[PDB]
Amino acid sequence: CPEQDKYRTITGMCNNRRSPTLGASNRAFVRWLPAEYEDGFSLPYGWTPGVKRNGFPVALARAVSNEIVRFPTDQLTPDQERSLMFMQWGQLLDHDLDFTPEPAA
Amino acid sequence: KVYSQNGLVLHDDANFLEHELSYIDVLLDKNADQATKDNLRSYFADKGLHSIKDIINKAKQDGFDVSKYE
Amino acid sequence: VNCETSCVQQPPCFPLKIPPNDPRIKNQADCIPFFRSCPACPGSNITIRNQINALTSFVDASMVYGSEEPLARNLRNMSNQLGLLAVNQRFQDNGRALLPFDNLHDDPCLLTNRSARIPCFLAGDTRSSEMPELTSMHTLLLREHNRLATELKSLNPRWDGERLYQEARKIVGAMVQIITYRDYLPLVLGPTAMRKYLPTYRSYNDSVDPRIANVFTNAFRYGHTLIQPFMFRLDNRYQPMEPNPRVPLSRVFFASWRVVLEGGIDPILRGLMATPAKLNRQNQIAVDEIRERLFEQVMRIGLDLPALNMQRSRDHGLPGYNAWRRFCGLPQPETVGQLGTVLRNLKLARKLMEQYGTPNNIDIWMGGVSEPLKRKGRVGPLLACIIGTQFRKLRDGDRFWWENEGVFSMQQRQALAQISLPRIICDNTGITTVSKNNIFMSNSYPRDFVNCSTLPALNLASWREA
Ligand SMILES: *[C@@H]1O[C@H](CO[C@@H]2O[C@@H](C)[C@@H](O)[C@@H](O)[C@@H]2O)[C@@H](O[C@@H]2O[C@H](CO)[C@@H](O[C@@H]3O[C@H](CO[C@H]4O[C@H](CO)[C@@H](O)[C@H](O)[C@@H]4O)[C@@H](O)[C@H](O[C@H]4O[C@H](CO)[C@@H](O)[C@H](O)[C@@H]4O)[C@@H]3O)[C@H](O)[C@H]2NC(C)=O)[C@H](O)[C@H]1NC(C)=O
Ligand code: HEC
Ligand SMILES: *[C@@H]1O[C@H](CO)[C@@H](O[C@@H]2O[C@H](CO)[C@@H](O)[C@H](O)[C@H]2NC(C)=O)[C@H](O)[C@H]1NC(C)=O
Ligand SMILES: *[C@@H]1O[C@H](CO)[C@@H](O[C@@H]2O[C@H](CO)[C@@H](O)[C@H](O)[C@H]2NC(C)=O)[C@H](O)[C@H]1NC(C)=O
Ligand SMILES: [Ca+2]
Ligand SMILES: [Cl-]
C-alpha cells in the first residue's frame, strides 16, 4: 500500500494499512455469530422437507408474512415526527454499504 | 461482471454506454485539441477499442445508431 | 439458473413455497422466485458458506462514484479536465443534469412503460432506478459533485481533472457522513442508544474492523417498515401535482420514465420533504404495495419483500432472534409470556409462537421489527444494538473519516460542519422552500419549512491552494 496517500481508493483497499482488504469491495462479509445451516455448512433451513430447526418445523416465509406482517392499507398510521425523506436516506445509505450479489439467469 | 438481484440484470460492464457516443464526436471534431483526444483514445483503448473504427463498431454491436458516423 | 420461471428447488434456486389459503396466490403449485446469494468459496466441503459484499463498507459515497475502477471511470466525464461526473446526453430536468442511461441487455425500466422507452439509469450503485425517489437522491448528489468541482476549478485554475474529481468526491463523501451521523442515526436509534453505541468520536483506531457483518444486511432492512404505499409529488406551492399526485408504488418500481417525462426530481423531493413516513406498529408492519405487488410490472409474479427478507436470512445461515438477543446482552425469552413481556404485546407473541414454536427460531428481521420502538427512535433494543454497533465500526475503523487528523484542515472541518441536506436541495434544484431544523423530522408544509435564502452555502475558501 502507498505509505503516503491523499484520497481514498475507489475499491476501499488500503484504508486499513495492516489488513488492506478490510472494507474493500468483492470480499466476504464478516460474521458476528457462526452460521446456522440445515447441514451445518451450506443448506438453508427450510431446504429439506420435514427437517426441523432446533426441535420445531421451519415456518414458510410467506406464511409468517401473511400471519404477522399483513394489515389493511387504508388504516396506515402516519409518523408525526419523520418525513418520508427519513425512509429514502436509509435506502440511499444502505446502497453505500452493501450489495449481496446473486447469480444471473 | 454482471450485477444481478431478484433475477434482474442491473448492470453489465461489457456494454457500450450512451454518453460515450458524445466522446466519438469529440474525436471526430477538427477543433478539439490533441490532449483532449489523447485522453479519450487512452480511455477507449483500455476497453480493447484501439482505433476509431473499433469504437464506432462497438457502439453499433450494442444497439446504438451510428449512421452519422458513416 | 432458471430460478425466474421454475418452482423446482435445485441450486442456485430456493423458491418460497405458497401456504394454504394464501390471500393472493391461490395456485399452491406456483412459488415466489428466489436465487441464493453467491457463496464466497464455491464448491467447498471445508468452509462454512458465506456471502460477498460487492461494495466498499465505508460511508464514502460509493453509491455515486462506484466500488470498482472500470465502473468509476465509466461514471466520469472524460471529454475535459473539469473533474465532472458524466450526465444524460438526451434529456435534462428544466436545464439541469440527469443521471446517464445504462445499457442492459434485458432492461427492466423499459417494461414499466413500453411506449416511453426510457431505460434504467447509470450510477455508483446498480439499484439507482429501483424507485424514482431513490433516483432523485442519486441525481441530487451527481449535481452536487459537479457544482463542487466547478467551484473548485474557479478557485484553483491550475488543478487538473483528476485533482478536481478527487477533491469534490472527498467533500461529497464527508457530506454523506455528516448527514448520516449527525441527522439520520440519532433519529433511528434514539438518544439512549445513540450515546451507548456511538459515543463522541476520539480518533481513527486501525484495530477496529470496518467490514459489514452479514447480519447488518438483513437487520438494516427495518426501513421497509417506513415505506408508504404511494409516490407523492407536489408542485412549487407544495400542493398535489395536477394528474396522479399519489401513484401506487407497484407502478413506480423501475419507472425511470416518470423522472424524465413526468416533471423531473423537484416534485419527488418536495413529496419526500412534506409527506410523513409510515410508522412501524406491531400490527401494521409493512404495506401490501411491497408485500403483495413488489416489482409486478417487470416480473411474472409480484414478490413479497418481508418474506424475501426472512428467506434471505435463512439463505445467509443467520442465527435466530434469541441468539442475536444474547449477542447484544439482552434477555432471551423462552415462553409465550416471556416473549409478550419483551414485546409489551402478548397477542403478537402468541402469533409469533404459533408460527415459530420457539423465540429461538424467529427470523432476525421479523423479530427485530416486532420489538417496541425506543424513545425518539424507530428501532427496538435488538436492532439498535446491531445497527449501532455496525455504524460505530464504520466511523472508528475509517482512516478517511472527516474528523480524523490529517483528512481535512481544522478550517475545512469548520466549513463542512455548516452543510445540510436542505441546502444541497437548494443548490441543485428549482426548489426555493425547503425543510427546517432536521430534514428527517420536519414533515408538514408550511409549518416545518423555510426559504433557501435563510440557509448559508458551503464556503470553499479553505480549499484554496495558491
Ligand atoms: C481500538 O479498538 C479496539 C477494538 O474495540 C472494539 O470495537 C470498538 C469499535 C468498540 O466497540 C470497543 O468497545 C470494542 O472493544 C480495542 O481493542 C479491544 O479492546 C478490548 C478491551 O481491552 C479487548 O477485550 C479483551 O479481550 C480479551 C480476549 O478475549 C476476547 O476475544 C475472545 C475471542 O473472540 C472472546 O471470547 C472474549 O469475550 C473477548 O472478546 C479478554 O480476555 C479481555 O478480558 C478482560 O476481562 C476483564 C473485564 O471482564 C478486564 O478487567 C481484563 O483486564 C480483561 O481485559 C477483554 O475482553 C478486545 O479484544 C480488543 N479488540 C481488538 C480487535 O484488539 C482497542 O482497545 C481500541 N483502542 C483505543 C485506543 O481506543
Ligand atoms: C424505496 C422502496 C424499497 C424497495 C423497493 C426495496 N427496499 Fe430494501 N434493503 C435494505 C438493505 C440493507 C438490503 C440488503 C441489501 C444487500 O446487501 O444487498 C435491502 C434489500 C432489498 C431487496 C433484496 C430482496 C431479496 O432478499 O431478494 C429488495 C428487492 C429491496 N430491498 C427493495 C435496506 C432498505 C432501507 C434502509 C433503511 C430502505 C428505506 C429500503 N431498503 C427501501 C426499499
Ligand atoms: C462533459 O462536460 C461538458 C461541459 O459541462 C458537457 O457539455 C455540455 O453538455 C450540455 C448537454 O449535456 C450542453 O447543453 C452544453 O452546451 C455543453 N457544454 C459544453 C461546454 O460543451 C458534456 O456533455 C459532458 N459530457 C458528459 C458525457 O457528461
Ligand atoms: C407512458 O408514457 C407516456 C409518455 O411517453 C405517457 O403518455 C403521456 O401521457 C400524458 C398524460 O398526462 C399525456 O398528456 C401525453 O400526451 C402522453 N404522451 C404521449 C407521447 O402519448 C403515458 O401516459 C404513460 N403510460 C402510463 C401507463 O402511465
Ligand atoms: Ca461505500
Ligand atoms: Cl453475522
Author numbering:
A (entry chain A): 167 to 271
B (entry chain E): 33 to 102
C (entry chain B): 279 to 744
The authors write:
Overall the crystal structure of the MPO–SPIN-aureus complex is similar to the previously solved complex with rMPO. The C-terminal globular “recognition” domain binds close to the active site access channel while the N-terminal “inhibitory” domain forms a ß-hairpin motive inserted in the active site. Gln37, the SPIN-aureus residue closest to the heme cofactor, is 3.2 Å away from O1D of the heme propionate, a distance where a weak interaction is possible. Importantly, no direct ligation of the heme iron is observed. In both subunits, only two residues of the N-terminal domain (Tyr35 and Gln37) form hydrogen bonds with residues of MPO, which is in stark contrast to the seven interactions reported by Ploscariu et al. in 2018 (21). More stably coordinated waters (green, wheat. and blue spheres) were observed around the propionate groups and along the most likely access channel (blue channel). Three of these coordinated waters need to be actively replaced by SPIN-aureus residues Gln37 and Asn38 (highlighted with blue circles in Fig. 4).
While rMPO is a single chain monomer with low heme incorporation, native human MPO is a ∼150 kDa dimer with each subunit consisting of a heavy and a light chain formed by posttranslational modifications, which are linked by disulfide bridges. In this article, we present the first crystal structures of the complex of SPIN-aureus and a truncated version (SPIN-truncated) with mature dimeric leukocyte MPO showing full heme occupancy.
